[PDB]
Amino acid sequence: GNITGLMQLADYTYNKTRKELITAELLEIIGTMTAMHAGKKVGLKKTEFW
Amino acid sequence: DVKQVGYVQQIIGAVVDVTFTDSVPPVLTALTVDAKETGTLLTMEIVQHLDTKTARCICMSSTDMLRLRTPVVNTGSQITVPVGEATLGRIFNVMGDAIDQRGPVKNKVRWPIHRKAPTLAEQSGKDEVLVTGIKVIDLILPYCKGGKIGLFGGAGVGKTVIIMELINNVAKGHGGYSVFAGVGERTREGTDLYLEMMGSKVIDLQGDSKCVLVYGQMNEPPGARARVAQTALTMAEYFRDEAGQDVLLFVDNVFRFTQANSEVSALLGRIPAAVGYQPTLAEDLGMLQERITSTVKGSITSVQAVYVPADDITDPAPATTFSHLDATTVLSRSVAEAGIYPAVEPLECASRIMDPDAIDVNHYNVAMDIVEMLTKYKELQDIIAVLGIDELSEEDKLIVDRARKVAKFMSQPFAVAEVFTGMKGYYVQLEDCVSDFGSLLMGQCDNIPEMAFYMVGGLDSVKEKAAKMAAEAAAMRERARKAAEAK
Amino acid sequence: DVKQVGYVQQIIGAVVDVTFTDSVPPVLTALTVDAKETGTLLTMEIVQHLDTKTARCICMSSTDMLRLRTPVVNTGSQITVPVGEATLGRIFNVMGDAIDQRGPVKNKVRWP
Amino acid sequence: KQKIGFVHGIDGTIATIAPAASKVTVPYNTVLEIAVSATNIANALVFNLEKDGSIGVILLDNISEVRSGQDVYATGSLLKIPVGFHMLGKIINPLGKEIPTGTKLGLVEEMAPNIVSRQPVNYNLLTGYKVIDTLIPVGRGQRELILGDRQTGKTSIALSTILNQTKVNNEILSKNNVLSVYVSIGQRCSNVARIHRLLTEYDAMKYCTIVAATAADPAGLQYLAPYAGTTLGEEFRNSGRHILLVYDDLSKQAVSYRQISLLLRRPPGREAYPGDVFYLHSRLLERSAMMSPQKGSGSLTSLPIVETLSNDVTAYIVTNVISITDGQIYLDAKLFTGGQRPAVNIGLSVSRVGSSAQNKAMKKVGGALKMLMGEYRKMAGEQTSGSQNVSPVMIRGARCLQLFNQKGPSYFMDAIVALYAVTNGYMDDVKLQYSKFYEFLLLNKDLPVLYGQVNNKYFYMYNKNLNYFIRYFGLNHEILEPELKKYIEIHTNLFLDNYQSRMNELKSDEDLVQLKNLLYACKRTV
Amino acid sequence: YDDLSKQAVSYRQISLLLRRPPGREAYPGDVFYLHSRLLERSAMMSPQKGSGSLTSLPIVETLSNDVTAYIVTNVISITDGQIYLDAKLFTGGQRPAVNIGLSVSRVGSSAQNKAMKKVGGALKMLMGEYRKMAGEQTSG
Amino acid sequence: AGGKRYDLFGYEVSVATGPFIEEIKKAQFYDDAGEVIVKMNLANTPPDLQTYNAVLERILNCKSKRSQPVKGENKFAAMMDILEEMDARSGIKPNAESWGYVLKELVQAGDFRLGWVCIAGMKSLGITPDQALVDANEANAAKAKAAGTDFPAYLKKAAPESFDTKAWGI
Ligand SMILES: Nc1ncnc2c1ncn2[C@@H]1O[C@H](COP(=O)(O)OP(=O)(O)OP(=O)(O)O)[C@@H](O)[C@H]1O
Ligand SMILES: Nc1ncnc2c1ncn2[C@@H]1O[C@H](COP(=O)(O)OP(=O)(O)OP(=O)(O)O)[C@@H](O)[C@H]1O
Numbered sequence A: 001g002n003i004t005g006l007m008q009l010a011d012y013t014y015n016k017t018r019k020e021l022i023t024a025e026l027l028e029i030i031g032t033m034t035a036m037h038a039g040k041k042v043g044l045k046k047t048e049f050w
Numbered sequence B: 001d002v003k004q005v006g007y008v009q010q011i012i013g014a015v016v017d018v019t020f021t022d023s024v025p026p027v028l029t030a031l032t033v034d035a036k037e038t039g040t041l042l043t044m045e046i047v048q049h050l051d052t053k054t055a056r057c058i059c060m061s062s063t064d065m066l067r068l069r070t071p072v073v074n075t076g077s078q079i080t081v082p083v084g085e086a087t088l089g090r091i092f093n094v095m096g097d098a099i100d101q102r103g104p105v106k107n108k109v110r111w112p113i114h115r116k117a118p119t120l121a122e123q124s125g126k127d128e129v130l131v132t133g134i135k136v137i138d139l140i141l142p143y144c145k146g147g148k149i150g151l152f153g154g155a156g157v158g159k160t161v162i163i164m165e166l167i168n169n170v171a172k173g174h175g176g177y178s179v180f181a182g183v184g185e186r187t188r189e190g191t192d193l194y195l196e197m198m199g200s201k202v203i204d205l206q207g208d209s210k211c212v213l214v215y216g217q218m219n220e221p222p223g224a225r226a227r228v229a230q231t232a233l234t235m236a237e238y239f240r241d242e243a244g245q246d247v248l249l250f251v252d253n254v255f256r257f258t259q260a261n262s263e264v265s266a267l268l269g270r271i272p273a274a275v276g277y278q279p280t281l282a283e284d285l286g287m288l289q290e291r292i293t294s295t296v297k298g299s300i301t302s303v304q305a306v307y308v309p310a311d312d313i314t315d316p317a318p319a320t321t322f323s324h325l326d327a328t329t330v331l332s333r334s335v336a337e338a339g340i341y342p343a344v345e346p347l348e349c350a351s352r353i354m355d356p357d358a359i360d361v362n363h364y365n366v367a368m369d370i371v372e373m374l375t376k377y378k379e380l381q382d383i384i385a386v387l388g389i390d391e392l393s394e395e396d397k398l399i400v401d402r403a404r405k406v407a408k409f410m411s412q413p414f415a416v417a418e419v420f421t422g423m424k425g426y427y428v429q430l431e432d433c434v435s436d437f438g439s440l441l442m443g444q445c446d447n448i449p450e451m452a453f454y455m456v457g458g459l460d461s462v463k464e465k466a467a468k469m470a471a472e473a474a475a476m477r478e479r480a481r482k483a484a485e486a487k
Numbered sequence C: 001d002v003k004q005v006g007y008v009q010q011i012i013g014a015v016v017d018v019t020f021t022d023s024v025p026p027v028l029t030a031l032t033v034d035a036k037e038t039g040t041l042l043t044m045e046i047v048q049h050l051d052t053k054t055a056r057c058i059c060m061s062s063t064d065m066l067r068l069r070t071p072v073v074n075t076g077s078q079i080t081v082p083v084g085e086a087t088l089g090r091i092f093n094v095m096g097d098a099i100d101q102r103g104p105v106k107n108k109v110r111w112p
Numbered sequence D: 001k002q003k004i005g006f007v008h009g010i011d012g013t014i015a016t017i018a019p020a021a022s023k024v025t026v027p028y029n030t031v032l033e034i035a036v037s038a039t040n041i042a043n044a045l046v047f048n049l050e051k052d053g054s055i056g057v058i059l060l061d062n063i064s065e066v067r068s069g070q071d072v073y074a075t076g077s078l079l080k081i082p083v084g085f086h087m088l089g090k091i092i093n094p095l096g097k098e099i100p101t102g103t104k105l106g107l108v109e110e111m112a113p114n115i116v117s118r119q120p121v122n123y124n125l126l127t128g129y130k131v132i133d134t135l136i137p138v139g140r141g142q143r144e145l146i147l148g149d150r151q152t153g154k155t156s157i158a159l160s161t162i163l164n165q166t167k168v169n170n171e172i173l174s175k176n177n178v179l180s181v182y183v184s185i186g187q188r189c190s191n192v193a194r195i196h197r198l199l200t201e202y203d204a205m206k207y208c209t210i211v212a213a214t215a216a217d218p219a220g221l222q223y224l225a226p227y228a229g230t231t232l233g234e235e236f237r238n239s240g241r242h243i244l245l246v247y248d249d250l251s252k253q254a255v256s257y258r259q260i261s262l263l264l265r266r267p268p269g270r271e272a273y274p275g276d277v278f279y280l281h282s283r284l285l286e287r288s289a290m291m292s293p294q295k296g297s298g299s300l301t302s303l304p305i306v307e308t309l310s311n312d313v314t315a316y317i318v319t320n321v322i323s324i325t326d327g328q329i330y331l332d333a334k335l336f337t338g339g340q341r342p343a344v345n346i347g348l349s350v351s352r353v354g355s356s357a358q359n360k361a362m363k364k365v366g367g368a369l370k371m372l373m374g375e376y377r378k379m380a381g382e383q384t385s386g387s388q389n390v391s392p393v394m395i396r397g398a399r400c401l402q403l404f405n406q407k408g409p410s411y412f413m414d415a416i417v418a419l420y421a422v423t424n425g426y427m428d429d430v431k432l433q434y435s436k437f438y439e440f441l442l443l444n445k446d447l448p449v450l451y452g453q454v455n456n457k458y459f460y461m462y463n464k465n466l467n468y469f470i471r472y473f474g475l476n477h478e479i480l481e482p483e484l485k486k487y488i489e490i491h492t493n494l495f496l497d498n499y500q501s502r503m504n505e506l507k508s509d510e511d512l513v514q515l516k517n518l519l520y521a522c523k524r525t526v
Numbered sequence E: 001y002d003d004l005s006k007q008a009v010s011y012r013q014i015s016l017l018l019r020r021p022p023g024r025e026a027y028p029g030d031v032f033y034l035h036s037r038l039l040e041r042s043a044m045m046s047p048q049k050g051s052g053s054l055t056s057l058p059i060v061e062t063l064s065n066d067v068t069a070y071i072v073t074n075v076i077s078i079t080d081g082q083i084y085l086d087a088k089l090f091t092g093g094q095r096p097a098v099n100i101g102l103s104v105s106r107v108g109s110s111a112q113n114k115a116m117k118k119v120g121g122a123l124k125m126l127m128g129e130y131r132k133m134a135g136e137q138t139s140g
Numbered sequence F: 001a002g003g004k005r006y007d008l009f010g011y012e013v014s015v016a017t018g019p020f021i022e023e024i025k026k027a028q029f030y031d032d033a034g035e036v037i038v039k040m041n042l043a044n045t046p047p048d049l050q051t052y053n054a055v056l057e058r059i060l061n062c063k064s065k066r067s068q069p070v071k072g073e074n075k076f077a078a079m080m081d082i083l084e085e086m087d088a089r090s091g092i093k094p095n096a097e098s099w100g101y102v103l104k105e106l107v108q109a110g111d112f113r114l115g116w117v118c119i120a121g122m123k124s125l126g127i128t129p130d131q132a133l134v135d136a137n138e139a140n141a142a143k144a145k146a147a148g149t150d151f152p153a154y155l156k157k158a159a160p161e162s163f164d165t166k167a168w169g170i
């Protein structure tokens, strides 16, 4: 009973840490993509206004 | 002279851009719009420049009904707030405006909220123990007069209760003006604190008040949560420098100052660091912390609380906050769930004044041996949780039966939490705090059971409770004997 | 009455963008391009407006061999699927095109 | 009329407006009326005004029917909704539109009362459950969180709390009533209909109202619904009245705002959330308060519901909301599976303020049972089946958890007298399974009146107006104590003689199954 | 060099405010090259250059006794040895709380003294043998 | 009115309550008197015992809570919840006149066991009842004892000796 009570908590924190490390890697990648979007410039958009 | 005028450009949240025709003022200059247009007064400090003829600036009150062509007026100075004895026994907003509906504050001068920290020549760190009467706080992490304190704990661990007990012990018998910054905490708690002090005559309005209250609570926007701590530091640095007087600085709490600066950096568009905090976190925290020092003129004894989301010490904001403080008090949740209150984790906690040069040798050696015993109890938890106490050596289970006694004795009731534990609060003096631990450490008291140490103060109170329990158990045995004879 | 026509302007995987000359259709509105170009029939549903004349549309089949600025007919509504007794004992894809080879389906009405 | 601009682009719930040629100023956090069709008009809120004249907007209505070439109009006013007594007894779109079944405009965005406008709560709020009204009291104004896993009895506590007030509010004056509001964020429309029919059946609808933001509804509208319920509550708050408010749930409000943030590419944080979800919830839960006598002494109590995952109070949202609320009630799925219902964990539950509001008659009983359960929790775990024991602590604990096993709201008078017996040992001889029948036979039936013993002078159960004396004097007063002890001693003696004897004598299987049927029926009705 | 973690937080702050792209744990990526530039300047100079020297004792804070963080691994990669201080041993009594299993020195006898060579070579054997036995609660 | 009352916060309040007490007395539905008190607390004119006694008089003399009826309305629970409001919320304690209205209400409503509780509560608080009222109380008690109306009938109905969910009425 005790071993099971520890095993469920261990599996839970294992999956918690797994999901948090996945979310973290995702937010790193999205931060970098966003920084690159900021690095890229806007164009001119020249057209007739009259 | 004539006042400069600028015109709004764009609005994204509480952040605003303003076009200044002639030239842009320096950073941190305040800028005011009349309450005719927005409906309420609105002061707005500059925080950064984007290009020439433009300035980005955060608002204090809400941006509701704000337009894109509103005239903004250059005050020509930073956010100034009042100072003096007229600021005593008064509640203050982020702007320094009083909200307690009493009357106009009779200030003589106003100081700005942003200020450079004291110089190394001015700084003077004198180490002196601050006897709180709380028993874990005395043994493990003895506070220092003029030093810094950190109560690092999640939601529902008891940092607010520790704060209330420290206030009731120190501030009433302090003889020096105290400051209380509420930064993103419960308006309930601010109301109860104002009433506990108007009843304890600390905010005696017909006499002498020893307190200053400043409150930007959770209802307030991040522009206020980010700039109420500075206003409290102004109020405290005035009494430190001008009055040349010792003061107390209870901050509840800086984690929402950090949250506010993060919520602002998000609107500013700065690239975030790891888990989602602001990039300027370390700088903002150092500019906040190093202002809190004890110079030759006076001393500031700070007590900052900190929140830990998801019960995570590896959170970078607390992880940075540890290095800036003199006494760390790391609370836990499993300890509170185990009935112990205050839910201190002495193995994770730490202090700076905890050296024999400052505290006496017996108090030092006792605390060292207690922490070692509990480190051994923690190592044996990995077995006790699995097999049981019956599978341990006699020495091991004696160390367990003694560390459990130490842990139960570390729990005690407070006068603030009388509503919950249903017991009056005790004030344990240091000399009676050390002899009890020494007796419990040298095996001088092992016949006493474990439960006689739970939620008591002083070995006399222990022996009283043990006598009470022995009496009750014997009366239950005679009662069951009579019930069996009658049966 | 006539039917609306648009022109492709970019293709990135399933995503395709369709310039128009009039009011953009609503979201989830179906846009068909004839099977002569791709080799098979091809439907794309509008998901995400980009401006007053562009319409991002997710594609449900393979957009291979789809040239640029091809004409694209607006169905006038979203994906109308068959319904009824005739539907029973058959298989249908998302667009209601039967894939079980068992001849056509004799339905009366066709609901979105 | 105005024609400030036109819909440039749309991305799900969020949209962007481009100005017209004659660009005109529009204020901040204002509602805009998008001319969808000849008669239909959507509704959408501004959130940022940019340098280029472009305006970011959150849409709220007819998002499928919005296009790009459509026009846009400005109201020049905050996002407002009607409010008053007429709104009671109705279910509405958060934008005021009524949802059918089978003048005064209030501001949706508003600041909370300051410390001087607020007050420490003084009067209790009865949830109809003995665990709560005994040991986790609730003042009128004390906002308290309800935690627990999915399908655990969180919504049912709120529903029973609402249904309890109907019996009282009709009796007492209207100034001391407790009106109510129930916001349903992300819940099924089927469940909302069943709740509407429940309140309509028990006639609680006249003192209640519902705000429906289902899972099929937009994310801006789920973000907006609790603000609208709080706005309907603040009129009764500032008008002196008392009122309850419920949020089912904040985790799905945070999910909707997370959708809006990620669609706006705002920088996320811990557990995908932006970082201003704490401010998001503090704006909502600081509007709850017990007002001051300078402002009318009204109230707005708030019972938000939050879903855990595998009994984990260490979640980010769970601890953010525990960092705001004035307490905690924790339902455990372990106990809900293990029969105890409501599944409150008294260790993980607490009421930080309700001691001041708890009536003394209930305060003393709650103190006694708090001590009793503090001893029971320890004596139950220390043995860990090493050796059983026969002690009054474990006895009274097992006799009390059966009373805590409940199904619907209970009357205060009924709630006390079942617990008083356990505290003073009268419920010691009776058995485990016959405690609910004992309670039903104590309260709804009267053994002394049945068996002729009428030595008691006034203390009985059929009237139920004795509640407002017990609630004012307390049972431990000198006049109520002896009659109480006599009634309970008689009830115990008559029970042990007549009923429990026959029960233990029953051996036929059909009789025992019919008796378990009766005990389950008594568990429901009690 | 007192804490280099605070110099990596500062370099991250600088680079992110200057709109450099982030990397692992939001660092720019070349903080390894940063500390490499800082620490490869340490050397024992040739006799041609005077036989001078500069020793370096950089310090890095640790969180929950892990050696898996980015900057921690990046600095263990650079520095020769390491003095690992374990909080479990600081809390467990011993001071300095050196963990010998994780603290080594990649120079050895050539640095220390003739009188220390013969003692260190005995203490290494002695501690390697005591590491295998000291787990036993002393019965004999 | 030389005495000055104060709030918990220390602010000043105004004892000028007469114009509100008159609006209470002019009422003919005793819920409007509570609506007056709602309009009275907002004016920072917190109620006095002389006002609560007017409210009790008005509940006693009014024919109904409202022009339209209400299900389950009791004139007693109002007149006792207002006394819980007196004692607990506001600190004021009722008097002999207050309990007098309460006893008159119980005499009019015909309840006698709770009237006896009110008598014993008066005696425990040193309040002297009115003999004209306790005589009517004992008279109603004797009447109900004679005619068997001292209890309801469903209590005196013989219980099922056999256990059954439909026999116990559940
Ligand atoms: N010494 C104590 N004795 C008994 N109960 C305590 C003690 N300290 C705290 N508690 C209980 O812990 C709970 C939360 O206390 P508190 O208000 O201090 O939370 P907190 O530490 O301020 O965290 P937050 O500020 O996020 O609410 C309450 O139920 C309180 O009764
Ligand atoms: N005290 C109780 N006794 C018996 N049954 C209960 C009790 N509380 C809840 N239930 C049952 O549990 C089921 C779900 O209850 P409820 O609707 O309260 O769940 P919930 O907390 O709203 O969770 P969710 O909202 O995620 O469905 C229903 O069948 C209800 O009858």
Ligand SMILES: [Mg+2]
Pocket: B159, B160, B185, B186, B189
């Ligand atoms: Mg707190």
Ligand SMILES: [Mg+2]
Pocket: D154, D155, D187, D248, D305
């Ligand atoms: Mg629910």
